[PDB]
């Protein structure tokens, strides 16, 4: 993918004379950086979305979901600083302003108050299906671009996302969940 | 302030029949909820902004500022869940989507790559002057609205913000910082 | 409120010659001590009530409520020794015998075996609505009586009680909870 | 002893269809349950009594006794939840309301302010003599009723109570303690 | 109170161009800063005084008082850095030289060797009566000066000082303490 | 690469009868072992070099660099025992004598006293550029030699080295660093 | 390999409507699931076998081997839940009944009492040679089946197994071990 | 057994007026106290003996036995204070002077330097056979004397001693141990 | 040196009958006590001085020095209670009132606000040169006075002070530090 | 002093061929070993004596002394293994049988039950005066015998013993202690 | 000894204007610095040598020696940074490049693969005999050169080295170790 938005190696600015793409060729950096910026915005958006649903859930599954969402945040949270800094280490600049989260994330954070357990869980399962396949695909893309290092990070993140996807899909595989 | 955007006690939705403003009158809730939604969006925006500057700083003050910004995040971070849940406990629904952060935060997160130490620090000092006065003013407003409980939370947050403001203002009170 | 039952500064007994109300006038002590004795008996009664319901709950919400009640006890428990000793520090003597708990608590502990989740949760939500408003009102009363110190303790306890009230009210805001 | 007050296996209520006395015959349950309800009420009453004396002690032995009573509470406190739940596991329902504590406890909690060290310590030593013999006797009774499991719990509790009894008896074996 | 001795916002010196009183007006800063400098010098003086008495106590209450004084130091010690830095955050400069401690503290540190338990304890109880009322009064003064933030700090410190005052007053309320 | 210096599977010595290359063919072992011996000597040399610069740095960046070098040692240090033992597990014998470190390391440890911050940092950045590319290349070589296991170790080490490279390059991207 | 025994995506049962193979095609799932079920049964069998030998070893190497086997269990044990849940996350159902362990494990647990150190160690070294090559081969198979995520798990497990293999092979490379 | 040497309930001395045998009859105390004094002296003697052998062992089993003896001390050590205080709680006075250890211990501490592994281990196995049977027999004796409390302590100590006996017997069941 | 100010063995006061100089002759005590009182006052003065500079530093080296001064306080702080109590153990009474700190300390605490990094660091380096030589000289003096015990304490304190001296001297060995 | 009883370098026994006195001449070893065997037996005897008095103390100072004796044991206990092993490292064999403790200790463990606080404390103060001077003298003797290493150990032990001596002497410097 | 190689106080370089020998005369620094550089190179060489033997040991004593060498590294490792920084604090510059380790160490690291337990242990015992005497001699030399501070460091290091020497000498004092 195209990564000009995340590339900091060609800026006209102070304290930037040494920035480069280390062992990656320019086109390889473009491929890898598009995945890192997208996955960073996605991870931050999942933190915000798990919190919004943690705060808004009501009804008899409140303890099940309120506590689960915090456990899932704890699993994914460290990857925010790690993905941002992998991008910086390769000569990028990570984006984290609200407008940039909205543009590059594959996950949308709700603006409405969603009380219903099934509505929350089905939304999250759809997101996590996309994000876990995303990391598997992005791992292969990075390996192909001669970046097995970023690929290895993604292999670990995909295992975590796939695990959370299973747990949430299991909870909603029940006709008595309204 | 007006707080319709944060008020969840009158929604037409499921699992919402019991939501109310507890011991606050409606107008008192409006006053307190405007402060909680604004301060929540501001705190999350400060987390994102301290991270963006942590990731982008370069030059000879890199260790000073990279490490300081993480210490400041650790001081303010717990207040994200606390402020959101104080709003929920009073019959509100906290907003955390990117569009809502941008609308209600008193702090803007950078979309550009800022390498320069002075530029980062002066921006943050301006923000923290506004946010610390904000919590002092909002504490008095909440006390006046018969909510000494939220006021007490704000008294603690203001002390933290004022402390961080001093440290950053001190670092930039130097003509040799370019 | 009247606090003769809690006042230890005028006793005819040994090792009591120095007991006084420190910086409070007698009438100020009466106001503050009535709130401390009542809130102490209430807090101990909530410990006993959360335990009784923890021990007696049955049915499919057993894990949700059994575990939640212990988390809520852990939040409120430290305030037992703190409220009792604030009363002692102001020249009072805290009461903790069963007959005194029953007389002064605003919360009644069940003598029957309550298996039903909704019955337990609705009872607790009614209690916590009363106790959280109680601490907000008692904070203002203490501040008015020139005791901002006890008021500050109450501001923290009210935030905890209000949080627990929200979580329990959320769980029961569901027609499928029988 | 008779245990109808603690027996939950025959209730006319919801979510109670499966409750039974596990491997104990009905008469064996009656014997064991009388000991568990009495010892539960006694243990909670000792927590309340050690606290009341911790809060009220004055004079030159204040540090000796204030700190000792908290160490003794820490030793006995875990047995509250353990004894209540052993009773639940055998098809009982434990009682913890103030009126039930007063009825079934072998220890009375003071309603007066006792400043005098000797008065407190002699009262506690009398209580602990009764409670430690109680657990030794109740252990033998439970073993005889084919419940070596509850007996084993009591053997451990008796060792703790007997140890605390020695320490308090030692402190008061002194004519200079007024 | 007058606070010129603690005010750093008008100095003729290097690295001081940005120093100001944040959200406080000049007269409000004068009120708050007088309380912070006085309470800082008082807290440091209480650390030194509790140590001097810890080191010099002899006789049969040695363990009671030697250990208690260290527990009381541990309770008050963190407030030294906190009060000094609240003053710095508001545009002050805290004083800590011996001559400044002696001038501004409301507590005098002994220059003589005091072996006698009663003499030590009565001296400390007089000090703590003054210091606990001081924090209650200074809290109200700060609130009136539109600084609820510093007031909140003082509310917590007063509760700690009042607790220590009770424990020491209790120990000496005994005719057999010589 | 050629690895006879590290191969222990053909020695004429005691307690060596069972040594073999496990699932690797001889030529595959030669490829993988050359990378492990070189990276082991390099890692130990980086420990020694970060220490020498930690001990010798002087001037106004002393705290920045003295502390950073210890944090970087803590990140890389565990890989010394891990790389040596991966080589042993594949039928090699790791070298660690000074003469062997000097021969096989891609990093040279200074014999002179280097006080100058820029001189130290530029030297380290050159080293880490070589070592991070080295691990990326060696990962691909190991994967090609049917050793994805050693490759995975290298993917993690490369991410650490690349991160440290960024931080040091950032510090020196400043004309005011002399 | 064929994996019908582990595939849960086509069951005729309740709460199973959503089960699928996520981002893997059916044939890819068959390949990966055969490796996960086999490695799960193997890992559990190694836990049981290391325990049986830990319990049965006698003679002068008792401390060497009794303690080593527990350290090796601690290294491999977490991979039991991890491998089972990777299989569940991909739409499988892991098998753990004794009959299924015996069928699918590549390691057999002893039914006899083996006192002899050499007999135990040689048996384990043969097992670990097979299991470490197994994980290397299964990693490559999973990567080929577009599952780099499971492959990455296996790369870590192989390094652990290969390390344990070396230590046990070393201990028995000695003619004086009878 | 006869226990006059350990009985403190009939002394002609100060601060001893309240000492009694709690719930045991005099003859029951004699039985139980003989076991407690003997087992106390035995446990202290095993601490001294395990240390002497830990300090004196030489030869090729040095690490096996030096480290094992410290692990065995850590298992038995807490029972020194526990057995002594059970005796005090029942109106006894525990003996610990060297002459009393020698008289009442069933284990003799070496006065010679024993370098030989087999000699040490065979000596310890003989001791532990006696001490583990001793605790089993003493448990039954205490139960018969209406002291199930002390019996329970002994049941736990016997399990520990029997475990250590197995490990040491295993090490020496080897003709190659010289 | 002369130590009458610190000598408590000849006081006309209560609870002082047993005070003596243990194994030191009177003149030996005078030598050792002069060093302990001086070093105690010096250490407390260094705590106060490091804090004053920690609180007052401004400009671009704020993080370097603010954090360093707290690390140096943590290194020296335990020696306050240790030196005071070594003096008490030898029959002295340690002085800690402000007037006594000022008289006996070899380090003066600033009464002015010092913003300038170089001014602070040069002042501290001069102090630490004096204090580290002081402990080396006082160690030799104590050894000569037959007190190798106090000498050993001083050997450890000197190593700490000398280390801090190096770090601060290094930071200021730079012409660009203004 | 003469040390034949502790010298293991000339034994006629197995596994003893390499034992020697390391860097000490024979006469130097004799001097140092006499001090180590005596101080080892003394330290173990102080552990036993502090325990006997901990177990036997009664009357109103029970908490003061029961708890203090355990704190003093915790301070001295590590020196048992350290002194024994310093002797082993120099070619000695440490003695720990009861008969050897009695022969070489400078402290006698009571065979009687001592309830009286003053009697216990005065006995201990006499012991600790002897033991602290002993370590000071033995430190000088070891230094003179070219063993500054053992001397350094003794300097630390003397400081601990002297501290405990002060605390116990202080407690008994009181005519009201009977 | 001569120490020009380690002396940094006379360099012609930047940021070195303030370097001096603190309280030591030039000739005293030469004596002390020769010992510090030699002992630093020796300690680092012992880390490398213990690792090489840890990695290469095979045969039936593998667990005994593999684990022991890591415990010995953990004991000596902290002295690397401590000895290097004592040299820096006295105006030296410590050497750590491979060529400098080889020149100044009294211990040689093996370049060959040594499988044999006796060969490893005998080599280490010879080294540790030299290094422990070295620290005893260097302690006396430093004391004579008016550096009791460095001498004290060496007294502690010698005790550690002498302890490790005993343990290794004990293991090899056995004819059955081949
Ligand atoms: Fe970061
Ligand atoms: Fe990986
Ligand atoms: Fe939350
Ligand atoms: Fe507050
Ligand atoms: Fe309390
Ligand atoms: Fe429970
Ligand atoms: Fe038991
Ligand atoms: Fe601070
Ligand atoms: Fe800096
Ligand atoms: Fe290792
Ligand atoms: Fe699991
Ligand atoms: Fe072994
Ligand atoms: Fe004890
Ligand atoms: Fe102290
Ligand atoms: Fe020392
Ligand atoms: Fe006391
Ligand atoms: Fe030991
Ligand atoms: Fe260092
Ligand atoms: Zn680019
Ligand atoms: Zn509303
Ligand atoms: Zn009153
Ligand atoms: Zn029944
Ligand atoms: Zn001003
Ligand atoms: Zn080969
Ligand atoms: Zn399928
Ligand atoms: Zn008797
Ligand atoms: Zn004197
Ligand atoms: Zn000899
Ligand atoms: Zn020189």
UniProtKB/Swiss-Prot annotation, chains A, B, C, D, E, F, G, H, I, J, K:
Gene Ontology cellular component terms for the protein in this record: cytoplasm; nucleoid
Compartment(s): Cytoplasm, Nucleoid
SUPFAM superfamilies xrefs: Ferritin-like
UniProt keyword list: Cytoplasm, DNA-binding, Iron, Iron storage, Metal-binding, Oxidoreductase
Catalytic function, reaction form: 2 Fe(2+) + H2O2 + 2 H(+) = 2 Fe(3+) + 2 H2O
Keyword Transferase: no
GO-annotated molecular function: DNA binding; ferric iron binding; oxidoreductase activity, acting on metal ions
EC number: 1.16.-.-
GO biological process: intracellular iron ion homeostasis
Highest taxon in the source lineage: Bacteria
One Pfam family in the UniProt entry: Ferritin
Chain sites annotated for binding Fe cation 2: 85
Residues given in the record as Fe cation 1 binding sites: 54, 81, 85
Gene3D superfamilies for the chain: 1.20.1260.10
EC top class named in words: oxidoreductase
InterPro entries: DPS_DNA-bd, DPS_DNA-bd_CS, Ferritin-like, Ferritin-like_SF, Ferritin_DPS_dom
Subunit structure: The 12 subunits form a hollow sphere into which the mineral iron core of up to 500 Fe(3+) can be deposited. The homododecameric forms at higher concentration of salt, the homodimeric form under reducing, low-salt conditions. The assembly of the dodecamer is irreversible.
Note: Dodecameric dps forms large aggregates upon binding to DNA.
Homology family: Belongs to the Dps family.
Role noted for this protein: Protects DNA from oxidative damage by sequestering intracellular Fe(2+) ion and storing it in the form of Fe(3+) oxyhydroxide mineral. One hydrogen peroxide oxidizes two Fe(2+) ions, which prevents hydroxyl radical production by the Fenton reaction. Both oligomeric forms of dps exhibit ferroxidase activity and DNA binding. Dodecameric dps is capable of Fe(2+) oxidation/mineralization. Only dimeric dps affords efficient DNA protection against hydroxyl radical-mediated cleavage.
Domain remark text: 12 di-nuclear ferroxidase centers are located at the interfaces between subunits related by 2-fold symmetry axes.
Descriptive protein name: DNA protection during starvation protein 1
Source organism of the structure: Deinococcus radiodurans (strain ATCC 13939 / DSM 20539 / JCM 16871 / CCUG 27074 / LMG 4051 / NBRC 15346 / NCIMB 9279 / VKM B-1422 / R1)
Name of the encoding gene: dps1
């Amino acid at each position: 993918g195209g990564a000009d938005h995340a590339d900091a190696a060609h800026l006209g600015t102070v304290n930037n004379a040494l920035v480069n793409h280390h062992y990656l060729e320019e086109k390889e950096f473009q491929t890898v950086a598009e995945t890192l910026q997208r996955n960073l915005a996605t991870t931050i958006s999942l933190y915000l979305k798990f919190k919004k649903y943690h705060w808004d859930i009501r009804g008899r599954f409140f303890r099940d979901l309120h506590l689960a969402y915090d456990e899932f945040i704890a699993e994914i949270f460290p990857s925010i600083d790690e993905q941002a800094e992998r991008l910086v280490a390769l000569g990028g600049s990570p984006l984290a302003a609200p407008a940039d989260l909205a543009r590059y994330s594959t996950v949308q954070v709700p603006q409405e108050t969603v009380r219903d357990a099934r509505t929350q869980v089905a939304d999250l399962v759809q997101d996590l299906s996309r994000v876990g396949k995303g990391y598997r695909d992005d791992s292969q893309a990075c390996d192909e671009a001669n970046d097995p290092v970023t690929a290895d990070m993604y292999n670990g993140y995909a295992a975590t996302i796939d695990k959370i996807r299973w747990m949430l899909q299991a909870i909603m595989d029940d006709e008595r969940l309204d």
